[PDB]
Structure formats: C-alpha cells, structure tokens
Design a binder for this molecule. Structure first.
Ligand SMILES: [Ca+2]
Ligand SMILES: [Cl-]
Ligand SMILES: [Cl-]
Lengths: 67, 159, 160, 68
C-alpha cells in the first residue's frame, strides 16, 4: 500500500481555518475514509484510492476532520 | 550556418519543495538572424554540457519546449542550468539561467495534513519522478485546481 | 408504469470559499444529487438561485451546461452568502441544496511585497460593469505570468 | 485609459522576496515600461497594454522594480 501525505498550501495559517479544512475534507472523502468519485476519478487510472485521512496540525493541531 | 543570439535570459525559475513547477520557454529568449525566434531551434537542457538524467527533478521536453519538475528537501537553494539552442547551421547558443528551490511554502506550520492510501508500493512512485509528478498533478485536479500547484507533497511512505 | 421519484441530495455542497479580487471556480460534483431514474448529477438540470439590475453584475455566475460555478467578488461582498442549488429531473421534480459562499478579505492585505500596475487602452466601464470581462482580465493576467488558468492574481483596483 | 493594479498572491510576505519579484518583473516587462510579448499576447484581444509599473510594498517597501 502507498500512503501519500500532502498539504493544500492555499489554506491560511492562523487562526485555525477549521471551516475551510472541513469543506476540503468532505469534498474528497465521505464521513468515513471512503474517497468520493471526484477524487477517485482524478487519481485514476494510475492510482486507485482506498481511504482518506485528514488530521489537523499547526494552529489546528487538536482537531481531526476525517476518520 | 548563420550565430543564434540571446535577447532575454530565462532569468529565474522559482520552485518549492514538494510542489510541481512548469516553465514554457518564451519565443523572445533566443533570436537568430536566419532562423528567427526561439521556437524553431533545437533546445537542450544541460548542467559541463552534462545532460539532465532520467531521475532528475528537472525535466525538459524538447518537442513542447516545456521545462517542468518537482523538487524534494535535498534540492533547496539556487541552481544554475544551461539552455543550448542549436540552429540549422549547426551552431549553438547557450543561456545560463537559475532555478531557486525554496522550502515548502508552509513548512511544518500547515493547518492540516492530508493522507491518502492507494494500491501499490511506494518504490514505483519514489523512483520515477514522472509518476510522482502525475500523482501531484492529479491531487490538484481532485480539488478542482488542475495545473495550479496548490498541492505540496509532504511524504510518501508504505502502509 | 412507475411514479417518478424525486431526486435526492447525497453530498451537500457545504461551503465555497472565495477571496476579494480573486477568480474562484467550483464544478458541482456528480455525487451531489442522485435520481432513481435519471442517475447522477451531471444528468440533471441544475439551477443556482439566490438583487440585480439590467446587467449581469452578479459576482457569482453558474453555467448549467458545464455545471460550473464561478465568479469574482469585490470589497462589498466580504462575508457570508447563502445560495440554493436546485436539481430538476426529466419529470420536473426538484431537490435543493442550501450552501454558503464565504468571501474573505483580499489575500495578504497590505503586506503584499509588490504592487503591479498596467495601463490599457479604452474605458474602464467595459470591465467595472461586465463581470465576465473582469473575469477575463484576471485570468489573462495569470496567463501572462505562466500560471495557466489559476487564481494567482488578486485584483487590487481598476481606475482611470 | 484603464489602469489596473493587482498582486500575485503566491509571493511570500517575509523576508522581502526581491529576487522573485524581479524575475516576475522581467517576464512581463522589459527594462523600461515596455510590455513584453508574453504579456501583450496574453491580454489580447480584449486588452492592449501600454505601460507597466511595478513598485515594492510591505517587506519590499523601499525597492522599485519597473521601470529599470
Ligand atoms: Ca426522478
Ligand atoms: Cl525559502
Ligand atoms: Cl477573512
């Protein structure tokens, strides 16, 4: 399995943009880990996504967004 | 022959760790007298006329005259490359330009860390710069940001 | 043979984040709506519903054919805005998704490292009235820097 | 005439990225105010550029990049 980690460098640093990160999180994943078709179809055919995780860091170090 | 000439240096390519960059060669870079603009000439990217390798984080398509790449943490700093333009007289002209690789735009103060698990082995990505370049471009497309480099790769590991 | 079932909303368009002077673009996902007979969202008729005047001066626009939402807000649009996305099937039944567009202040504010100015020929009315011309301006200025079709340009002012 | 002012919102705030602004400056403008063809061709046909001005601000408040 290939675990790929990235950051969206458009997010503001402070204060914690929890509402912006949430929207970005639910756009690629459902309530659980399941990737949405926008994300599956974009990474296909070269990469097939199984599970997505979005955890907070920095100003959002305490929150978690996608299980 | 003719000598092909340099009017406007490629000058500066600003790049960031983990972020795809793309620079298409302008037509007013080289200007020959007999062959005109930078488009018709044969362009080759070089380091002592040492060709860019297949695992190089910088690449150059001679057909589209497109320079692109994806640097990692070991490439931070300023880099000087040389663009060779060969005319239909066989002569060459050289443009020395600079690629300055900065640190990741947010570093470790990023508000969120995204992870995704795929099917395969991390070697197939961590060996081929192009497969890793596709990954980063498709990650941007997943957010509707196709060809924007709104994605900064943080790590690739096995799980 | 069977009664038309109403389209259903599966994944809320929750939030659209936009910035003053900066082009934004949101393509409506196909798993947003779902109809028993007409399937996914691209197979439904979408209509965005919210002021005006004679000119299409709305800082938000929506193409129903591409199902693409786009726009370009100014200083007077900062804050939260509520919109409604309507999805109608072939039988005329509809589902509605209420979502919010939050327009933030101009990126970087006054700590921007550089201010670019350019003078063109003509009257500023063709841009300051027509949102589509003003969208063209900002997309072409980004193209002038090699940034294809990206929102790397933030409009600061247009004057005479 | 139409004077348009804008910022490239990808530029870092601190320290003064004078070298990046310079590169961006010479790609759209020559040493003087003259717009380069990459800028002219991108804005055409809707807009015809006449002169470009780029002055520093914020962390680059003291510098000026176009003209010269
Ligand atoms: Ca139906
Ligand atoms: Cl840096
Ligand atoms: Cl704000």
């Amino acid at each position: 399995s290939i675990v790929v980690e990235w950051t969206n460098n458009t997010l503001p640093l402070e204060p914690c943009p929890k509402e912006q990160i949430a929207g970005l999180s639910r756009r690629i994943a459902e309530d659980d880990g399941k990737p949405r078709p926008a994300f599956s179809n974009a990474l296909e055919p070269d990469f097939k996504a199984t599970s997505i995780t979005v955890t907070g860091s920095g100003s959002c170090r305490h929150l978690q967004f996608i299980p | 022959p003719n000598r092909p000439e340099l009017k406007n240096h490629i000058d500066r390519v600003d790049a960031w760790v983990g972020t795809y960059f793309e620079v298409k060669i302008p037509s007013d870079t080289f200007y020959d007298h007999e062959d005109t603009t930078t488009d018709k000439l044969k362009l080759t990217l070089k380091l002592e006329q040492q060709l860019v390798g297949e695992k190089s984080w910088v690449q150059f398509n001679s057909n589209s005259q497109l320079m692109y790449g994806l640097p990692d943490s070991s490439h931070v700093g300023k880099h000087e490359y040389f663009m060779h333009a060969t005319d239909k007289g066989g002569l060459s002209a050289v443009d020395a330009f600079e690629i300055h690789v900065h640190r990741r735009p947010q570093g470790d103060r990023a508000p969120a860390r995204f992870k995704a698990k795929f099917v395969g082995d991390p070697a197939l990505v961590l060996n081929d710069i192009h497969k890793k370049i596709a990954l980063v471009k498709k990650l941007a497309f997943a957010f509707g940001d196709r060809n924007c480099s709104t994605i900064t790769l943080q790590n690739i590991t096995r799980g």
